[PDB]
Design a protein around this nucleic acid. Structure first.
Ligand code: MG
Ligand code: MG
Ligand code: MG
Ligand code: MG
Ligand code: MG
Ligand code: MG
Ligand code: MG
Ligand code: MG
Ligand code: MG
Ligand code: MG
Ligand code: MG
Ligand code: MG
Ligand code: MG
Ligand code: MG
Ligand code: MG
Ligand code: MG
Ligand code: MG
Ligand code: MG
Ligand code: MG
Ligand code: MG
Ligand code: MG
Ligand code: MG
Ligand code: MG
Ligand code: MG
Ligand code: MG
Ligand code: MG
Ligand code: MG
Lengths: 181, 258, 181, 71
RNA sequence: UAUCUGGUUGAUCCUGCCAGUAGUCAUAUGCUUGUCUCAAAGAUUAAGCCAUGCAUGUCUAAGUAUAAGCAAUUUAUACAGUGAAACUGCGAAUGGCUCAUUAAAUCAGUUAUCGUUUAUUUGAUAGUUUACAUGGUAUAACUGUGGUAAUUCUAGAGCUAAUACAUGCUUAAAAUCUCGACCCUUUGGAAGAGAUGUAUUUAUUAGAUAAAAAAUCAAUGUCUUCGGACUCUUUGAUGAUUCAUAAUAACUUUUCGAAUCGCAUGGCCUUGUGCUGGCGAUGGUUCAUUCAAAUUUCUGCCCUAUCAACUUUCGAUGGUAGGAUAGUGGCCUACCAUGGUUUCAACGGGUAACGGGGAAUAAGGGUUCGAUUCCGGAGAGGGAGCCUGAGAAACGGCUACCACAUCCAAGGAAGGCAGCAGGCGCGCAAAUUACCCAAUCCUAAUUCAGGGAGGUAGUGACAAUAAAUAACGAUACAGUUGUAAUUGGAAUGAGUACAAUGUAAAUACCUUAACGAGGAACAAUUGGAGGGCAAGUCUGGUGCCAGCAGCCGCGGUCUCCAAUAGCGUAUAUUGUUGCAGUUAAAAAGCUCGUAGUUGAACUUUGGGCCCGGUUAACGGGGCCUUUCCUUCUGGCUAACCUUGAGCUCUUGGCGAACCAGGACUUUUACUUUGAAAAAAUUAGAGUGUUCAAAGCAGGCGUAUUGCUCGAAUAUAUUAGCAUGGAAUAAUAGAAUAGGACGU
RNA sequence: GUCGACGUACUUCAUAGGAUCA
């Protein structure tokens, strides 16, 4: 038979789902960033845990260790590129200091809100899922899209979007036709 | 099993062929030929997955049946003909000649050569023995039987074979200070100079090899192939000249050239 | 039926092994060919690979070699007189390797007459005088020559090659086997 | 797994034969035609004796109790 | 366990205790189930039974066509285009499925074949064997006559081919070795007649050597200056061989050494259908290589000692000889001895035991799972046995027996789904008896044919990724908050659908004209908690109350909490590091004692110098200090003496050190480093798959032609191999000296 | 036979103590 295709889980249930403080923090995060369910928060927590565990393991090694240098440089480069880690904080120690909110900040929904295209984070999500937002020359319909530093400046309304210079949507031309009749 | 196998699963195929694991279920099984199965590159993989001339096996068969591909100066038509180390692949229509040489990463590399350098090959003398009627002969690593060798030629030496006549033009003795090429093991593809041969009667001989960067490594004698004297290779070497580069230095060079 | 596998035997420790698998063809055995004196009967056997073996069911002639004189002549086999493995072959007159047999001496005697001009053209005389020094032979061989039957040992395997070649007993060989006779 | 109960022993009688032989050799310490032919009562007795010997149900629980109580 | 909740009384605190609350994985099951990507399909320890269908055939210019086959044709009166049928060759031993048996067996790593077979591929390799080319010692297909109820049943007669079958020639010279008529008695010579390639069988011979010189006996050869002289004289490989190879004498129901085919018509001439000649296919001996096969060395397997002795009569251990094998071998036979394993656990038993790469958990040690995408082994209902072929103990090959079971005219015939679909095993249940060879590769005479291998789609939420079910306002009502079957015009995909893309053809995805939203009825779910109501019902009593509960009353036909396209229910889920043994598990009544485990100290320490490394500390080497392994041979040659020409060249000696090899030699444990440990998997680098899961892709210019980076790196226990150490723990040596050394 | 022993599986009884207050 054909060789296997690998698959993996991108989230894991927390050690204690029932902590009141954890519930309150999840509520705050979901409301602030307009997240649909707890699965998104669990996913981002899983990723951040993976990066921080890797940072711990690399820190454990002796300094100048070639594996330490190479892997730490790669991880810091990736974190700086994705925008979570600032330019001046290129040390594994500051990688270990990251928080979930930083990753939630880079989400395309939050960025679309911040740049002024939407009046609410929920409005940003609706715009994204309705094919109105384009990164560069490309339409993206995924709120969880993680925006890079280079790509943040190219977020705009899509050319095909009615808000981006295309023809009016079905409702607009329908009403215009009815008024004309 | 009740007889010889005729199928080769993709996962079980040699790694250095670099085959997609999801394209299909089976991989080309090299037919019997001059080179061993695990140390050979079938023509289908060479024409399709390396040169990208053919898009699929049927086009490769179409190419071969046209008699455009020559291996070692002879036309081959088998899609799974096991081309291997030091074999010359000539495509006259493209006016291209290739010599199959491992790169530093350990994979067969597309190395373009001039016609003059394509006129000959190098072979490691695997055996020297008297045949019937008292005629000495030499068997090389590619299974070529050459009669009436120069008497000084001994096992593990290198012979420069002219493809047109299949005769020895010159030979290199295996001695300290000679330039050698690694053809097996984790050091596959590296180039260096012999430093010393450890002999172990009834066991595998070991050879110490010093690279141009002064790094040293030990390899079993079966995996060593003498290719010339230091600084004077008898064949053109691929890019990198068989020098192993650390991951960090590779990163630096890649970033610089980009 | 006959099989050469080592599995059905007991282990070295004395354990009774279980049946690992059914019998395989590549470890077979075939019935013995009790070769005997008589009119020639040989039938082929198709063996592993394309090779062939010859089964000497009956035979009455063989090539025998006189080593001291370095000659080999073809001679009829009188019979089997003594065999080391088993006497039943001697009683039944079965031919196998190492069996001691009696053969006529006429070709060897005639050869010795011609070559040495002694008994047990000037060209002949010259050659005989040149070779006269080596004429003397063992007394034991000469006595058999007088009797007309020489003792010979079969060095071939009739059950495999279909031949019955041998060589004349001599020296310590002949003395020992005569003692055993 | 050597002598485990099978679903249909009666279908694989020959197999059981081998097992019995093995036992006879393994536990001995404690106790002490050519089908390839051009032309192909004691054998009937052989059939009956072997099939009966191989297949004898083990004497039942209630049967042990019955023999004890009859005694 | 942990946190949290609750109970421990006349109340409130502080302890302690008790009950409930954790987990993924696994099995079964319930409810729901819109979109994108991706992907799996075992299980009654029943390897239990199967209707029907399919799953292995194959032809190029190049083996055989007078098919009374088709079609062209006078580009053929031997054929020639295409070609059914059949012979011939090749394949069917690969692939696919399952885990029944199997406990030093398989398997993993690591060895060996100087112990053997090997179709095929690749490269070499055969002047030594009527020929303008031999037979039926012959037949198929086909014509024709027939039997049976029936089957991939076939009987008689008539024909005809080969790369089938069986035969059989044609080709240089020379050398050497035999047998030798004859002249002649010599130092003899010698016309002639024979034999030599390969294959098999046997016997014998060569396959040299650590280094130098002579005297004779016999045979007997070149030479000269007739005296004596006689040189350069031939031998490969391995650590190792009776190895490779060669030679001598014979032997063989004994082989092979082209009686084959396509395309094309060049060159010499004494002009003959004369001689010579190209490019290919297919065959063929032997050697080597390759795909392989067989056996094989060392180490490593769960539970069981209430299994302690086992194996040996009928082979168990070993020797000898033979038979057999492809070959080694008690594999088997005949005669011999009495051996082999074991408390360091043999032998016997259990195993819901195929082994491994791997999977889960864990902080680490460990514990469990691994039928299941790859490797290896075994099987095709159960035993037994074989033809063919290079390769089979084959089962989609055959034969018997055991058990099942189909047709039947009762005489007989045909069977093996643990291949793909699809059924039965219950009376309770679960993928389609679908499409295709378009990709992957495999088979064949072979580009083309074939392939339920494989791919494509369909089908229970297997396991995984992303992600809709509304967003922005105005008005109204109610105690600056909440509620709308209030209200405004903007957006959009679920779905429908021109078209195009996609695909072998389709479906789907991505696109997209045109439709597609206010209860946006285009009507999201699964669990838990808590109320309130009556001319109502039941039960009990220190009146009007309390408990239970309340779809039911006189007529008449509600709120909150958790997860979320997913949610619930049931079962299941020992201490080496590191436990305890006075008083609450567990120290045996005492002693001796075998195995096992463990076992006092001591042997070269210290000191003085030199070199080059790191960041004054740290490590790495050399010397000296009573301390160097020994010996021989060979290779190169330093330094050291010297002459001569200007620290460098050069003459002639001496040649240490170093390297190579032969001899010489206490053995391990431990530890360092280097190879090795398949791929997949794990960690991990790069990469805007629209993000992600993933995959190994991709990237940059572009009017024109194009250029270019990758597909890294790390891990792996024990065993085996190579290597540096000399601390710790062992082991051997000189004692009746049978001890060491020697110019 | 509502039998004995053992094995197996379950149920059950033993939890309050100190301080302050009335
Ligand atoms: Mg649109
Ligand atoms: Mg070796
Ligand atoms: Mg349901
Ligand atoms: Mg809906
Ligand atoms: Mg859609
Ligand atoms: Mg057992
Ligand atoms: Mg073993
Ligand atoms: Mg073939
Ligand atoms: Mg060949
Ligand atoms: Mg006939
Ligand atoms: Mg015996
Ligand atoms: Mg023997
Ligand atoms: Mg089992
Ligand atoms: Mg298991
Ligand atoms: Mg398994
Ligand atoms: Mg089988
Ligand atoms: Mg079955
Ligand atoms: Mg069978
Ligand atoms: Mg099969
Ligand atoms: Mg079948
Ligand atoms: Mg099936
Ligand atoms: Mg399938
Ligand atoms: Mg052909
Ligand atoms: Mg759909
Ligand atoms: Mg003791
Ligand atoms: Mg001590
Ligand atoms: Mg190791």
């Amino acid at each position: 038979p054909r060789a296997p295709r690998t698959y993996s889980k991108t989230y894991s249930t927390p050690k204690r789902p029932y902590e009141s403080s954890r519930l309150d923090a999840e509520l705050k995060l979901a409301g602030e960033f307009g997240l649909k369910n707890k699965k998104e928060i669990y996913r981002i927590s899983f990723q951040l845990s993976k990066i921080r565990r890797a940072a711990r393991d690399l820190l454990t090694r002796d300094e100048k260790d070639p594996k330490r240098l190479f892997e730490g440089n790669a991880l810091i480069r990736r974190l700086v590129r994705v925008g979570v880690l600032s330019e001046d904080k290129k040390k594994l120690d500051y990688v270990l200091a990251l928080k979930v909110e930083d990753f939630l900040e880079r989400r395309l929904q939050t960025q679309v809100y911040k740049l002024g295209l939407a009046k609410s984070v929920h409005h940003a999500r609706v715009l994204i899922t309705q094919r109105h937002i384009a990164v560069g020359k490309q339409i993206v319909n995924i709120p969880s899209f993680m925006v890079r530093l280079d790509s943040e400046k190219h977020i705009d309304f899509a050319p095909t979007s009615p808000f981006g210079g295309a023809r009016p949507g079905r409702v607009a031309r329908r009403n215009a036709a009815r008024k004309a009749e | 099993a009740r007889g010889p196998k005729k199928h080769l699963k993709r996962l079980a195929a040699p790694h250095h062929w670099l085959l997609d694991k999801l394209s299909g279920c089976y991989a080309p099984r090299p037919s019997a030929g001059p080179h061993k199965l695990r140390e050979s590159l079938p023509l289908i993989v060479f024409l399709r997955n390396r040169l990208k001339y053919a898009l699929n096996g049927r086009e490769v068969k179409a190419i071969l049946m046209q008699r455009h591909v020559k291996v070692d100066g002879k036309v081959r038509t088998d899609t799974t003909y096991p081309a291997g180390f030091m074999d010359v692949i000539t495509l006259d229509a493209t006016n291209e000649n290739f010599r199959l040489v491992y790169d530093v990463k350990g994979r067969f590399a597309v190395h373009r050569i001039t016609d003059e350098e394509a006129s000959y090959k190098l072979g490691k003398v695997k055996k020297v023995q008297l045949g019937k009627k008292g005629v000495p002969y030499v068997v090389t690593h590619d299974g070529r039987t050459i009669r009436y060798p120069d008497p000084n030629i001994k096992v593990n030496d290198t012979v420069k074979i002219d493809l047109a006549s299949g005769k020895i033009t010159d030979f290199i003795k295996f001695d300290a200070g000679k330039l050698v090429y690694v053809t097996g093991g984790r050091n596959l593809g590296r180039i260096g100079t012999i430093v010393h041969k450890e002999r172990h009667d009834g066991g595998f001989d070991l050879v110490h090899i010093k690279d141009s960067l002064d790094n040293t490594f030990v390899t079993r004698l079966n995996n060593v192939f003498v290719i010339g004297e230091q600084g004077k290779p008898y064949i053109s070497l691929p890019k990198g000249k068989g020098i192993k580069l650390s991951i960090a230095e590779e990163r630096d060079r890649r970033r610089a050239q980009q | 039926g006959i099989s050469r596998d080592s599995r059905h035997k007991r282990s070295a420790t004395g354990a009774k092994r279980a049946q690992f698998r059914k019998k395989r063809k590549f470890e077979l055995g075939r019935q013995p060919a009790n070769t005997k004196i008589g009119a020639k009967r040989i039938h082929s056997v198709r063996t592993r690979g394309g090779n062939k073996k010859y089964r000497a069911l009956r035979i009455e002639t063989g090539n025998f070699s006189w080593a001291s004189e370095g000659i080999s002549k073809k001679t009829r086999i009188a019979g089997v007189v003594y065999h080391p493995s088993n006497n039943e072959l001697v009683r039944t007159n079965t031919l196998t390797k190492a069996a001691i047999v009696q053969i006529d001496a006429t070709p060897f005697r005639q050869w010795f007459e011609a070559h040495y001009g002694q008994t047990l053209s000037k060209n002949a005389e010259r050659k005989w005088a040149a070779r006269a020094a080596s004429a003397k032979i063992e007394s034991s061989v000469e006595s058999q020559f007088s009797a007309g039957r020489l003792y010979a040992c079969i060095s071939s395997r009739p059950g495999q090659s279909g031949r019955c070649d041998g060589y004349i007993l001599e020296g310590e060989e002949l003395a020992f086997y005569l003692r055993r006779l | 797994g050597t002598y485990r109960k099978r679903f249909n022993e009666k279908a694989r009688s020959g197999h059981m034969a081998k097992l019995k032989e093995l036992k006879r050799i393994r536990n001995k310490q404690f106790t002490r035609p050519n089908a390839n032919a051009e032309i192909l009562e004691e054998e009937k007795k052989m059939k009956k004796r072997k099939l009966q010997e191989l297949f004898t149900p083990k004497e039942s629980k209630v049967s042990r109790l019955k023999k004890k109580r009859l005694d």
